[PDB]
């Protein structure tokens, strides 16, 4: 009555279906955010932070004690799983028992991509190494080298008097490190867990099955990421932009920001046309911002 | 705890319109597929063909 062989097609034919699902999950963290493999508890990010630079070698050869600081990502772990209810035995009624794997897979595959937008959105609400808000007015910039001295207020974070509108956020991918850090530790697996000597399914009466993964999300450095709740508009994306890319390092000294994608919800997908990839201004004249960025819509910022 | 998941005014009710969500792999309704539409040619029984 009960085989390897059935028991080994069943695994097979359900290890396919999730694999298909998974594969062909749309993948869109890659984009604005770096991928760092570990094989440990954690990682330590204590080179976040000041931006290298070259020296005249006027006496001798500086070197740099790094700061023993981390960031202390702490990568943690979720997962979910299933039943079949051994009815199909009997019957061998396997038309149902495949969209729950469908999901499954496309559950896995989108995962990190809402986790990372999530983070992404709740930047005011996430403190940084700095050891305040990631968006906020009062960011550290010291005078000198060292990092001594009064220190000046920056901020990256623009709101109107009141009734803030949609949020929109700038970033940079020229870098080698995006803003945002999607950390893995280990590749979401599955377990075909389902034997006939095992337990719970002879006291039970189902065959449970599986899947487990263990990955994080965390910030980088601020000097990249912008967010700003004002409309959409020409005059304050240029605003942003000018701001953005005039950012000086410790002793005034600019950084040679380069403003690459700007992230909207698919609410704004207008203003975002409007502002870059058409040729109509408002006015109607030609745009001096045409193609001056990639825009990326997205439903995970709603 | 109270859901509910339909809204009504207190009276004079108007159109019904419907809000759903196609994330999940599997959306609210389910449609079965038990045979495939097929079409028999039949007109030789002594009825219907020439009488």
Redesign the interface.
Do not use: S
């Given at each position: 009555i009960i085989t390897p062989a059935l028991i080994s097609a069943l695994k097979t034919s359900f290890q396919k279906h999730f694999q298909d699902?998974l594969a062909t999950a749309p993948s869109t963290y890659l984009q604005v955010a770096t991928v760092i493999p570990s094989t440990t508890a954690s990682n330590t990010y204590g080179w976040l932070g000041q931006f290298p630079k070259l020296r005249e070698w006027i006496g001798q050869r500086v070197i740099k004690d790094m700061a023993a600081q981390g960031y202390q990502i702490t990568n943690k772990l979720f997962e979910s799983t299933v039943g079949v209810k051994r009815t199909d035995i009997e019957d061998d009624n396997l038309g149902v028992y495949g969209?729950?794997m469908?999901?499954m897979?496309?559950a896995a595959g989108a995962h990190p991509d809402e986790l990372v937008f999530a983070l992404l959105k709740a930047g005011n609400a996430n403190l940084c190494y700095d050891g305040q808000n990631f968006f906020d007015t009062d960011h550290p910039v010291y005078p000198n080298v060292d990092g001594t001295g009064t220190a000046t207020t920056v901020s990256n974070l623009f709101a109107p008097a009141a009734d803030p509108g949609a949020a929109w956020y700038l970033l940079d991918t020229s870098r080698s490190l995006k803003p945002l850090i999607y950390q893995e530790r280990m590749k979401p697996s599955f377990t075909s867990m389902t034997k006939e000597d095992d337990e719970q399914v002879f006291m039970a009466d189902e065959y449970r099955y599986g899947v487990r993964s263990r990955c994080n999300v965390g910030f980088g450095f601020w000097q990249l990421a912008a967010m700003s709740t004002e409309e959409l508009n020409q005059v304050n994306f240029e605003k942003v932009y000018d701001a953005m890319r005039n950012q000086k390092a410790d002793g005034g000294r600019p950084l040679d920001i380069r403003p690459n994608l700007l992230v909207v919800p698919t609410t704004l997908r207008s203003k975002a046309k409007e502002v870059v990839g058409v040729q109509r201004l408002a006015n109607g004249a030609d745009n001096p911002n045409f193609e001056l960025v990639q825009v990326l819509d997205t439903a995970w910022l709603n």
């Open positions: 699902a969209p729950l469908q999901e897979g496309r």
